[PDB]
Write a protein that binds this ligand. Structure first.
Ligand code: HEM
Ligand SMILES: N[C@@H](CCC(=O)N[C@@H](CS)C(=O)NCC(=O)O)C(=O)O
Ligand SMILES: [Ca+2]
Ligand SMILES: [Ca+2]
Length: 300
């Protein structure tokens, strides 16, 4: 049972300590705000929000197909954790720190804030197999929805949480297939607006460095706002998994209207986003855990 005051006696200043450290990280690299919330997402969708993703090793989740050469911000988490451990030795879990850092990243980026409930335990093992099953930018909308349903989330959560792509980057490798010969017909993805198509072809030329990135949100790259959804109405979503929320056949009577509603009301988007984040932060696999003192390895 989570509670915002679970550390009221054991670590009174936790919230402030984490906030100050997140602000320091964002000052050094603004993209880190995006990277941190993505870590929380990838943590919660595998063995629950138990910091299993932070564990190193030959069988680490960091090597899973969706995480390798992709997930980032591990050094920043170590720094935050070190500050918290200096202030309250062996008290706060890495799982909670990741949750708080995600919330702070949204807030410091102009997004909505919410009171985080604490008390999560850190897992004892990595689940690389499950991490390979994380949502893919290449799969159909129904497949993405099924992955959210599997962890007790739903369609509304899919659309609202996809809004996190209102900031951050995505490498050429996960969207360049939409730029030249998307289906074998020799044409780019027909749902991609031509001016964006032109800019992306410049960023991702055939045979070039596929690790170069482009902003997920072409209007306000670092500001957390509903501009992500406005992009979709114009066919300017970067990943196929973004644009299908508006343009796919399945979206018509499912996600399409939600995308249009968030575009009309940022307050609505912010309300649903906070709601979905809290729900995602409540995912647990019920396995035994502990308060991990070094996020990269178990205590014993
Ligand atoms: C709905 C299914 C989703 C898919 C298919 C997906 C896919 C992706 C992909 C392929 C990237 C680029 C990775 C890279 O460049 O290596 C990315 C980045 C990102 N995703 Fe998602 N994502 C999804 C959901 C979410 C959710 C639920 C959140 C968090 C609440 C999220 C937050 C992020 C952020 C903020 C970035 C930027 C990371 C950075 O710049 O370091 N994503 N996502
Ligand atoms: N999914 C539940 C509702 C859960 C919920 O409250 N979801 C929030 C978003 S996080 C909402 O406003 N709508 C979701 C929904 O209607 O399912 C249901 O269908 O009764
Ligand atoms: Ca996890
Ligand atoms: Ca934005």
């Amino acid at each position: 049972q989570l509670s915002p005051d679970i550390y009221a006696k054991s670590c009174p200043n936790l919230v402030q300590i984490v906030r100050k450290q997140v602000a320091i990280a964002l000052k050094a690299e603004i993209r880190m705000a995006a990277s941190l919330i993505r870590l929380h997402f990838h943590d919660c969708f595998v063995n629950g929000c138990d910091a299993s993703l932070l564990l190193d090793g030959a069988d680490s989740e960091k090597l899973a197909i969706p995480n390798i050469n992709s997930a980032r911000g591990f050094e920043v988490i170590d720094t935050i954790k070190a500050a918290v451990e200096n202030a309250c030795p062996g008290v706060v879990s890495c799982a909670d720190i990741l949750t708080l850092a995600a919330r702070d990243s949204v807030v410091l980026s102009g997004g909505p804030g919410w009171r985080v409930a604490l008390g999560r335990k850190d897992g004892l093992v990595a689940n690389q197999n499950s991490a390979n099953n994380l949502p893919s930018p290449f799969e159909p909308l129904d497949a993405i929805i099924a992955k959210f349903v599997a962890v007790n989330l739903n369609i509304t959560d899919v659309v609202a949480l996809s809004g996190a792509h209102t900031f951050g980057q995505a490498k050429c490798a996960v969207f360049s297939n939409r730029l030249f010969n998307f289906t074998g017909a020799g044409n780019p993805d027909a749902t991609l607006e031509t001016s964006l198509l032109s800019n992306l072809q410049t960023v991702c030329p055939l045979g070039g460095n596929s690790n170069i990135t482009a902003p997920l949100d072409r209007s306000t790259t670092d500001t957390f706002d509903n501009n992500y959804f406005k992009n979709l109405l114009e066919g300017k979503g970067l990943l196929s998994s973004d644009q299908i929320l508006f343009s796919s056949d399945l979206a018509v009577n499912t996600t399409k209207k939600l995308v249009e509603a968030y575009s009309r009301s940022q307050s609505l988007f912010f309300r649903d986003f906070t709601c979905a984040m809290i729900r995602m932060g409540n995912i647990s696999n019920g396995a035994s855990g502990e308060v991990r003192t070094n996020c990269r390895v178990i205590n014993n």
